[PDB]
Design an enzyme around this catalytic site. Structure first.
Site, PDB file in Angstrom:
ATOM      1  N   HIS A 147     -16.905  12.456  -2.680  1.00 25.49           N
ATOM      2  CA  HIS A 147     -16.006  11.265  -2.918  1.00 25.49           C
ATOM      3  C   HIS A 147     -15.881  10.061  -1.805  1.00 25.49           C
ATOM      4  O   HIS A 147     -15.307   9.041  -1.926  1.00 25.49           O
ATOM      5  CB  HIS A 147     -14.651  11.861  -3.212  1.00 25.49           C
ATOM      6  CG  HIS A 147     -13.842  12.077  -1.817  1.00 25.49           C
ATOM      7  ND1 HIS A 147     -13.654  13.372  -1.408  1.00 25.49           N
ATOM      8  CD2 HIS A 147     -13.368  11.314  -1.050  1.00 25.49           C
ATOM      9  CE1 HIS A 147     -13.050  13.505  -0.110  1.00 25.49           C
ATOM     10  NE2 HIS A 147     -12.693  12.010   0.015  1.00 25.49           N
ATOM     11  N   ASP A 192     -17.062  18.266  -5.308  1.00 25.38           N
ATOM     12  CA  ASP A 192     -17.105  17.294  -4.085  1.00 25.38           C
ATOM     13  C   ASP A 192     -18.158  17.561  -2.983  1.00 25.38           C
ATOM     14  O   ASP A 192     -17.634  18.049  -1.907  1.00 25.38           O
ATOM     15  CB  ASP A 192     -15.656  17.116  -3.772  1.00 25.38           C
ATOM     16  CG  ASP A 192     -15.208  15.975  -2.785  1.00 25.38           C
ATOM     17  OD1 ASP A 192     -16.157  15.022  -3.028  1.00 25.38           O
ATOM     18  OD2 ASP A 192     -14.245  15.654  -2.304  1.00 25.38           O
ATOM     19  N   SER A 218     -11.967  13.708   5.658  1.00 24.34           N
ATOM     20  CA  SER A 218     -12.711  14.054   4.321  1.00 24.34           C
ATOM     21  C   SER A 218     -14.125  14.242   4.989  1.00 24.34           C
ATOM     22  O   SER A 218     -14.318  13.265   5.563  1.00 24.34           O
ATOM     23  CB  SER A 218     -12.606  12.878   3.647  1.00 24.34           C
ATOM     24  OG  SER A 218     -11.534  12.497   2.585  1.00 24.34           O
TER      25      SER A 218
HETATM   26  C1  LIG Z   1     -10.020  12.240   2.952  1.00 28.04           C
HETATM   27  O1  LIG Z   1     -10.307  12.331   4.442  1.00 28.04           O
HETATM   28  C2  LIG Z   1     -10.480  10.848   2.799  1.00 28.04           C
HETATM   29  N1  LIG Z   1     -11.376  10.389   1.543  1.00 28.04           N
HETATM   30  C3  LIG Z   1     -11.663   9.287   1.124  1.00 28.04           C
HETATM   31  C4  LIG Z   1     -11.153   8.361   2.275  1.00 28.04           C
HETATM   32  S1  LIG Z   1     -10.312   9.137   3.224  1.00 28.04           S
HETATM   33  C5  LIG Z   1      -8.588  12.966   2.339  1.00 28.04           C
HETATM   34  C6  LIG Z   1      -8.471  14.087   2.974  1.00 28.04           C
HETATM   35  C7  LIG Z   1      -7.145  14.641   2.634  1.00 28.04           C
HETATM   36  C8  LIG Z   1      -6.650  15.963   3.092  1.00 28.04           C
HETATM   37  N2  LIG Z   1      -5.376  16.209   2.889  1.00 28.04           N
HETATM   38  C9  LIG Z   1      -4.659  17.439   3.196  1.00 28.04           C
HETATM   39  N3  LIG Z   1      -5.757  18.250   3.872  1.00 28.04           N
HETATM   40  N4  LIG Z   1      -3.644  17.308   3.658  1.00 28.04           N
HETATM   41  N5  LIG Z   1      -8.482  12.716   1.091  1.00 28.04           N
HETATM   42  C10 LIG Z   1      -8.538  11.995  -0.209  1.00 28.04           C
HETATM   43  O2  LIG Z   1      -7.694  11.077   0.113  1.00 28.04           O
HETATM   44  C11 LIG Z   1      -8.963  12.217  -1.589  1.00 28.04           C
HETATM   45  C12 LIG Z   1      -9.618  10.985  -1.869  1.00 28.04           C
HETATM   46  C13 LIG Z   1      -9.002  10.924  -3.473  1.00 28.04           C
HETATM   47  N6  LIG Z   1      -7.696  11.085  -3.077  1.00 28.04           N
HETATM   48  C14 LIG Z   1      -6.646  10.665  -4.319  1.00 28.04           C
HETATM   49  C15 LIG Z   1      -5.077  11.234  -3.752  1.00 28.04           C
HETATM   50  C16 LIG Z   1      -5.269  12.443  -2.890  1.00 28.04           C
HETATM   51  N7  LIG Z   1      -4.091  12.649  -1.838  1.00 28.04           N
HETATM   52  C17 LIG Z   1      -4.986  13.762  -4.164  1.00 28.04           C
HETATM   53  C18 LIG Z   1      -6.114  13.945  -5.081  1.00 28.04           C
HETATM   54  C19 LIG Z   1      -5.674  13.117  -6.128  1.00 28.04           C
HETATM   55  C20 LIG Z   1      -6.606  13.328  -7.714  1.00 28.04           C
HETATM   56  C21 LIG Z   1      -7.579  14.310  -7.602  1.00 28.04           C
HETATM   57  C22 LIG Z   1      -7.956  15.046  -6.231  1.00 28.04           C
HETATM   58  C23 LIG Z   1      -7.096  14.870  -5.220  1.00 28.04           C
HETATM   59  C24 LIG Z   1      -6.673  12.783  -2.140  1.00 28.04           C
HETATM   60  O3  LIG Z   1      -6.414  13.754  -1.503  1.00 28.04           O
HETATM   61  N8  LIG Z   1      -7.636  12.110  -2.302  1.00 28.04           N
END
Ligand SMILES: *[C@@](O)(c1nccs1)[C@H](CCCNC(=N)N)NC(=O)[C@@H]1CCN2CC[C@@](N)(Cc3ccccc3)C(=O)N12
Ligand code: NA
Ligand code: NA
Lengths: 250, 27, 10
Positions: free
Chosen positions: A43, A99, A197
Site C-alpha cells: 500500500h 500488503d 508503514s
Molecule cells: C502507515 O504507515 C502508512 N501508510 C501509507 C501512508 S502512512 C500506516 C500504519 C498505521 C499503523 N496503525 C496502528 N499501528 N496504530 N497505515 C495506513 O495509514 C493504512 C493506509 C490505508 N489507510 C486507511 C485507514 C487506516 N487507518 C485503516 C484501514 C482502512 C481500510 C483498510 C485497511 C486499513 C490505515 O491504517 N491505513
C-alpha cells in the site's frame, strides 16, 4: 511510533527509508533482506483511494539512517529501484490483504556497521516464535502521536491472540495478518503510527541469536488507542511468493 | 547468510538495552 | 524539514 524511545546506533541495520524525490519526503519505512532486495508494504506504492501509485523513477531508498531529516554523510547509502513487485493478490479494495511488495536495487549495497540484512523466517522459527504473549519490535520515523521524531524510534509489543484481534475492529482480518499491542488492562503502551508503514516487526530467535522479520507495519485505526491494536502483514505466510520472485527476477 | 547478526551488537557480543525484554517473553 | 541530498541521486 508512540510511547517508544530513540533507537541506539546500529540497533536496526536493516531499516530502510522510502523517500519521495519530489516533493522530498518520507513515504514509509522498509527493510533490507539482501544487498539488492528491500521488503515493504504494497500500500506504500499502490493505493488508488488516495490516488497513490508510485513508480520506480518516483522513488529513492535510503539505508543506514538514524536521523529522520539530515543527509548522513559517510553513513547512509542512497539507491535507486531497478523494479517494483507488488503481490499480485494484494487487496487494496477491502482490507489491505497481502500488503507486501519487493524492490530490487539497481546495484548491490555494501554492508557496514550501520547496514546489514535481516533474516526471513523458516517454517519452524515461525512456528516457535509467532505466539500470543511473545514480544517483537517495531521501528520507524512515524508519528509520535495519533509529531515526527528527530531519530529512529523503537517499541517492543506483545503478539495478541486472533480472537482478541478480530473483536477490536469491523475490518475483516485474514490469515495473512497478525495484530500486536498491549491490553488496556496490561496498562503499558505503544503502537506504530502513520508514516511507520512498511517497516519491520522483528523478533530475536532464542536458538541461533539471529533477528528475523515476522511482520510488516500495515494498518491500524488511530494510534495507541486502548483496546485497539496494530496490524502487520504475516511474512511467513507470504514467503512462497517472496521466494518465487527472488528466484525468477534476480 | 550472515543475516540478522548486527555488526555493533551480536558480532561483538554486546546487548541492546531492551532486547532482554523480548527474550524473557519467549517463556 | 528534510535536509537536501547530493544531486547524483536524482
Ligand atoms: C502507515 O504507515 C502508512 N501508510 C501509507 C501512508 S502512512 C500506516 C500504519 C498505521 C499503523 N496503525 C496502528 N499501528 N496504530 N497505515 C495506513 O495509514 C493504512 C493506509 C490505508 N489507510 C486507511 C485507514 C487506516 N487507518 C485503516 C484501514 C482502512 C481500510 C483498510 C485497511 C486499513 C490505515 O491504517 N491505513
Ligand atoms: Na470484529
Ligand atoms: Na492499543
Amino acid at each position: 511510533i508512540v510511547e517508544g524511545s530513540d533507537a541506539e546506533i546500529g540497533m536496526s541495520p536493516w531499516q530502510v527509508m522510502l523517500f519521495r524525490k519530489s516533493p522530498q519526503e518520507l513515504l514509509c519505512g522498509a527493510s533490507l533482506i539482501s544487498d539488492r532486495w528491500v521488503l515493504t508494504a504494497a500500500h506504500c506504492l499502490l493505493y488508488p483511494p488516495w490516488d497513490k501509485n508510485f513508480t520506480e523513477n518516483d522513488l529513492l531508498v535510503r539505508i543506514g539512517k538514524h536521523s529522520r531529516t539530515r543527509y548522513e554523510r559517510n553513513i547512509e547509502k542512497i539507491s535507486m529501484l531497478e523494479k517494483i513487485y507488488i503481490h499480485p493478490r494484494y487487496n487494496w479494495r477491502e482490507n489491505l490483504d497481502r500488503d507486501i511488495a519487493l524492490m530490487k536495487l539497481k546495484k548491490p549495497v555494501a554492508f557496514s556497521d550501520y547496514i546489514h540484512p535481516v533474516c526471513l523466517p523458516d517454517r519452524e522459527t515461525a512456528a516457535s516464535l509467532l505466539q500470543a504473549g511473545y514480544k517483537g519490535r517495531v521501528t520507524g520515523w512515524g508519528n509520535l502521536k495519533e509529531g515526527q521524531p528527530s531519530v529512529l524510534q523503537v517499541v517492543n509489543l506483545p503478539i495478541v491472540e486472533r480472537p482478541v484481534c478480530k473483536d477490536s475492529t469491523r475490518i475483516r482480518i485474514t490469515d495473512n495478518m497478525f495484530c500486536a499491542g498491549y491490553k488496556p488492562d496490561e496498562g503499558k503502551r505503544g503502537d506504530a503510527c502513520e508514516g511507520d508503514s512498511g517497516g519491520p516487526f522483528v523478533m530475536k530467535s532464542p536458538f541461533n541469536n539471529r533477528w528475523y522479520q515476522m511482520g510488516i507495519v500495515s494498518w491500524g485505526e488511530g494510534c495507541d488507542r486502548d483496546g485497539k491494536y496494530g496490524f502487520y502483514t504475516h511474512v511467513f505466510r507470504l514467503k512462497k511468493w517472496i521466494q518465487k520472485v527472488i528466484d525468477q527476477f534476480g | 547468510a550472515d543475516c540478522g547478526l548486527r555488526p555493533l551488537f551480536e558480532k561483538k557480543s554486546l546487548e541492546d538495552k531492551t532486547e532482554r525484554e523480548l527474550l524473557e517473553s519467549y517463556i | 524539514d528534510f535536509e537536501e541530498i547530493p544531486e547524483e541521486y536524482l
